[PDB]
Ligand binder design. Structure first.
Ligand SMILES: [Cl-]
Ligand SMILES: [Cl-]
Ligand SMILES: [Cl-]
Ligand SMILES: [Cl-]
Ligand SMILES: [Cl-]
Ligand SMILES: [Cl-]
Ligand SMILES: [Cl-]
Lengths: 311, 311
């Protein structure tokens, strides 16, 4: 059997701040052209979908792919890691915990660069495990004073849990109230219609639209995209095909000319925010660079800990 | 964790004849539209390539992807196999031996359909792993009396091993003499340019061009394509994009109108050979249907033997 890195191993091996460092470096490599990704490709027959994506990151000594089935809208994932030094397979890796940490770490990287530095109100659409991870990681990055939550399944107990975890009081709020009050809005839903009116967004707001990989899902309306100074994506290529919202946006939004790549933001090449008033949208799809980079870092850390071979 | 199938397990679990039966059935399914494939996709950075391809084959209860690195022409292959019934990951599978077996098995299916039935002279370009496996499986399928081999780098021992494995006298021969004398020609090299003059090919010949899957390399020349009655491919979408033997063809060759898919040949829909004198070319690049189908067969067979869960 190949070495298998499971979710519990990832939970202990990868801190949010390590995840942010690893992803920052991998994106800088991607921007310099010293790392490469495979776009997400989907195949389907008999109601069973198979998808693949991946990356080659020689700067971190790894290459890999994430492969997964989709059946009735449910996913089962395997990440497979190889050595970039000699090409040999290294390990398989669960995707659940890794994806939770990765999604919030990328949102933090983007908000750190593009949200107002003194942001103090976080709005959350969806307060399950991904929403809560975003709240924890963002609370560590910003001096937050409130977390406003919209999720019909949040309970007073979930709110106290998240509040205690973050050290910031969390409370329920209506969608229009979140949009109007929040400096940073994260949307983490399988919605197929817009979560709030673009008109309602606070001046200066950063929106991290995480949403879903599933067909027909979208969270933002044309107005939000039209209002935005910039729409930050992981990769020009994939994110402009993949995402429901970006593909749908009519020529009116001017979306095209305002799309900027995360690597350019992180490298300090984009100058995306011109003014305090600017709205910035970050659209996350998950690209193969991110999974591979974090699984490689986990492999390296667990190997050192356990006497596994170096990548 | 995951169950793993290694190269030694495939060597023992998978005969050529079984591989041919499994692959013939998978192609029929693909031909009927009930199975689907992912084209090969290649990603490269810092001299390290990562490739993926795969398939969903509900009829055989499996889906999966082969993922491999290439570093200086050297490959490391792993198949990730999933259940088409419930989507769950079933196994990792080393795929060195699998790849070797499936490529030769598919060429034997094509030759069985398209070469002269009483073919007795095999011409082989390339006496390495791939060429030798083709010679072995063809020696079982046809009543061969001679194997004529050209490989500019091979030692006398390699040739002696081929003769012994095949139970057929094997000798070194000049490319022009091979082309002139062979009933079946297999090209299994990394040559970037044609190996012999297409004008030299014997009337009636079946030519299995296996070595090239880069759009800038070709093993056959334009005259070969012109002379050929039919050029049979595994899947038009992939082959016509990848195979330099086809990409670089002059319009002169009439290639467009003579391309036929392997599934239509195996289903008895194609009638590709119109005359004994006809030359027929099979251009192979390797496609994900073959990998998935053979990995599923191996899994099922080993699972029955070892008590592993059913797909
Ligand atoms: Cl790609
Ligand atoms: Cl500020
Ligand atoms: Cl959206
Ligand atoms: Cl910026
Ligand atoms: Cl298909
Ligand atoms: Cl005959
Ligand atoms: Cl292959």
């Amino acid at each position: 059997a190949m070495l298998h890195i499971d979710d519990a191993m990832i939970e202990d091996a990868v801190t949010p701040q390590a995840a942010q460092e690893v992803l920052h470096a991998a994106f800088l490599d991607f921007g310099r052209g010293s790392a490469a990704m495979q776009r997400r490709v989907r195949t389907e027959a008999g109601g069973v979908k198979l998808s693949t994506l991946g990356a080659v990151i020689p700067g971190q000594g790894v290459a890999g792919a994430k492969v997964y089935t989709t059946i009735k809208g449910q996913f089962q994932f395997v990440i497979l890691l190889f050595s970039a030094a000699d090409g040999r397979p290294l390990a398989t890796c669960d995707a659940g915990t890794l994806t939770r940490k990765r999604t919030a770490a990328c949102t933090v990287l983007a908000a750190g660069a593009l949200a107002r530095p003194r942001s103090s109100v976080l709005g959350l659409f969806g307060a399950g495990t991904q929403g809560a991870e975003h709240a924890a990681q963002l609370s560590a990055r910003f001096a937050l004073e409130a977390i406003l939550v919209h999720d019909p399944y949040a309970s007073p107990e979930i709110l106290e849990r998240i509040g205690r975890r973050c050290g910031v009081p969390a409370r329920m709020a209506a969608p229009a109230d979140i949009a109007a009050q929040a400096d940073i809005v994260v949307t983490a839903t399988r919605s197929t219609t817009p979560l709030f009116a673009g008109q309602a967004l606070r001046a200066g707001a950063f929106v991290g639209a995480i949403g879903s990989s599933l067909p027909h899902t979208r969270e933002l309306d044309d107005e939000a995209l039209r209002r935005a100074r910039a729409v930050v994506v992981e990769w020009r290529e994939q994110t402009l095909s993949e995402a429901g919202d970006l593909v749908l946006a009519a020529p009116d939004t001017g979306l095209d000319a305002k799309v900027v790549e995360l690597a350019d933001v992180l490298a300090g090449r984009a100058a995306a925010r011109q003014a305090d008033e600017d709205i910035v949208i970050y659209k996350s799809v998950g690209v193969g660079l991110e999974d591979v980079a974090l699984a490689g870092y986990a492999y390296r850390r667990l190997a050192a800990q356990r006497g596994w071979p170096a990548p």
